[PDB]
Structures are given as structure tokens and as C-alpha cells.
Design a protein around this ligand. Structure first.
Ligand SMILES: CO[C@@H]1O[C@H](CO)[C@H](O)[C@H](OC(=O)c2ccc(C)cc2)[C@@H]1OC(=O)c1ccccc1[N+](=O)[O-]
Ligand SMILES: [Cl-]
Length: 138
């Protein structure tokens, strides 16, 4: 078990066939989770489950450039449950991040930040107990 917020270094950034696995349990009164794939201060890929946005559950994805949030991509398919263990897998492909939760495909997010080899940190934060965060080459 790790202390959140947690920074996972991604040395030399990400590359196609890099599979990032995040294992954790959602806290019982969860409001939000965030994965932030960072290129310095920019967020190439913000993955943000929201448990209570207007009494709905939604996943918000976005990019932050020069400290400005861009256009949101939203997904109502919401595989997280308060109190339950999850696995998030982010598979880097040539043109998008592919996200599967609990071995079920969830969403794709097209690369807005092009410099994948400079996306050198993943921030993990929010209402989770973090069990592990790691990556491998498939
Ligand atoms: C102004 O809205 C932004 O949309 C951005 C993407 O487009 C980011 O999701 C932003 O999240 C943050 O940057 C953020 C929020 C809180 C903390 C502690 C750290 C970062 C932020 O999101 C929120 O603050 C937010 C708004 C409504 C419901 C739930 C949340 N939320 O889960 O924080
Ligand atoms: Cl870029």
C-alpha cells in the first residue's frame, strides 16, 4: 500500500506498447480520483472519475497546457464503485491512450501532447487506497 498522492516516474516518457497498471481500492465515501500524465507542468492526459457531479457519476478526460484546461471528453460508463478494488490499465498506442478498468475496455483519448517521450510522470490522487502502480512493455 502506498500514500496518495503518489508520483510514478515514467523515465524517458511513454511509448506504444507501454501498459501502466494502477491497483487500488475506492474509499467508501469517494468523491473523485485523478490520474495525471504530466509533461512538466502540462497534463497530457487527465483521467478523472467523479462520483457526485450533479448526483451523476461521470469520467472526465482533459489536457492542461500552460495551466489552462482544454476541451473535456466525458464518459458515463463508470466501472468504479465506492469500497471496491479496481485495476486501471492505460495502454499507450501510437495515436491514443486506451483505458481498460477491471479488464473491460472503457475509453480512448487521442494524443493532444505529441512529445510522448517527455510525459515523464504519472500523478495518482484522490479518494483511493493505492495498492500498486507499475508499467511493463507488452
Ligand atoms: C474546474 O473543473 C476542473 O475540470 C478539470 C478537467 O477539465 C479538472 O477535472 C479539474 O480537477 C483539478 O484540476 C483538480 C481538482 C481538485 C484537486 C484537489 C486537484 C486538481 C477541475 O475539476 C474539478 O474541480 C471538479 C469539478 C466538478 C466536479 C468534480 C471535480 N473534481 O473531481 O475535482
Ligand atoms: Cl507536444
Amino acid at each position: 500500500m502506498l500514500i496518495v498522492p503518489y508520483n510514478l516516474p515514467l523515465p524517458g516518457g511513454v511509448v506504444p506498447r507501454m501498459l501502466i497498471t494502477i491497483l487500488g481500492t475506492v474509499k467508501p465515501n469517494a468523491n473523485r480520483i485523478a490520474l495525471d500524465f504530466q509533461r512538466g507542468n502540462d497534463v497530457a492526459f487527465h483521467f478523472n472519475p467523479r462520483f457526485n457531479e450533479n448526483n451523476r457519476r461521470v469520467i472526465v478526460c482533459n489536457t492542461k497546457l500552460d495551466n489552462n484546461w482544454g476541451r473535456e471528453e466525458r464518459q458515463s460508463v463508470f466501472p468504479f464503485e465506492s469500497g471496491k478494488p479496481f485495476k486501471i490499465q492505460v495502454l499507450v498506442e501510437p495515436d491514443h491512450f486506451k483505458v481498460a478498468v477491471n479488464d473491460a475496455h472503457l475509453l480512448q483519448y487521442n494524443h493532444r501532447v505529441k512529445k510522448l517521450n517527455e510525459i515523464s510522470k504519472l500523478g495518482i490522487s484522490g479518494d483511493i487506497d493505492l495498492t500498486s502502480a507499475s508499467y511493463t512493455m507488452i
